[PDB]
Amino acid sequence: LLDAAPCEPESLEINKYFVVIIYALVFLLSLLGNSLVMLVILYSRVGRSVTDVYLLNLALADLLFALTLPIWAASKVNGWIFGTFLCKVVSLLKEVNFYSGILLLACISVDRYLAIVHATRTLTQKRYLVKFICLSIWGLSLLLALPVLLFRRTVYSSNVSPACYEDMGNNTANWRMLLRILPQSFGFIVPLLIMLFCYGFTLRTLFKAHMGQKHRAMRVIFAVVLIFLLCWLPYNLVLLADTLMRTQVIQETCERRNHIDRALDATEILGILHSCLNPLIYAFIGQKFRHGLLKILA
């Protein structure tokens, strides 16, 4: 009989209450950093370059994501008790801004590639399309977040608390697994490959250069790539593990389910730090922004 018994979900309030403080801390830090980046960029219109436009869009996306975080924290505390309307709205905002952030990082990568590698060539002139590239990225992000709005509701279980989950009919499991392809291809793989190509060739050109500031630029590029990987690779690895398990590729057991759930929680917490870390890596690591910020404070 024990050979065939239901898998009992496993929880731990010790982490439930700790996740609230983690989310609140990230909320505050992202709010402050993105607000400062926006203020510094928008205070003076002098010297508004392509990078400034990209950073302004990125700060907007990160600020919106952070602004949605607290509702997610309360949900983690007590489950989605807020209704279906807020489930759809908050999910749409969160996913739109997630896609926007990733694609803006890829755009910044391509911009730096064109500015450094093709500095002598005429292709660098094509990096003056920031406004329409950013608008297209926002549009694509809005397009890719439609399934979240269309197929989400508050699902009530019998052994678990209500969740802002999907409802796609009798085959919701398989459709959800397929819909997972979008966040893992337009959200991890394609941006990761674009960033790797662009920054690899950028590093190849810099290493052969004779500048005095090549070294700091190389360190900054390495930090950007490593932060992106640290933030997003673990979550997508855990997601792929779950997808493999659901399809019987990896044998399924209760303990493995518990492990994947814990991993998903931890990796979501880890990935939520991109909003906090973007302002430090892309905006305040350059002398222009720091000088501007010091100027404004007067």
């Binding site: 065939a4 979900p9 496993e10 929880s11 699902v155 052994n159 409802d167 779950d242 057991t253 998903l264």
Partner: protein, 69 residues
């Protein structure tokens, strides 16, 4: 009381032949956002929970006898 961001089926494998004398209750859950297959879970008088195979005639017989009362 617990939490989860991934709803999963409540049964990994199923049996057939649970004796009604040891059945306290039976729960039937239709396909939905949780699982792609119907789930039958019998809670016995001693607290043990046993999954059942929906296709087996035994489950249908047990349920109909229980309903007849």
């Amino acid at each position: 009381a617990p939490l989860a961001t991934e709803l999963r089926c409540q049964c990994l494998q199923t049996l057939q032949g649970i004796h009604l004398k040891n059945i306290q209750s039976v729960k039937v859950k239709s396909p939905g956002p949780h699982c792609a297959q119907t789930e039958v879970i019998a809670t016995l008088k001693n607290g043990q929970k046993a999954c059942l195979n929906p296709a087996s005639p035994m489950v249908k017989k047990i349920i109909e006898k229980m309903l007849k009362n």
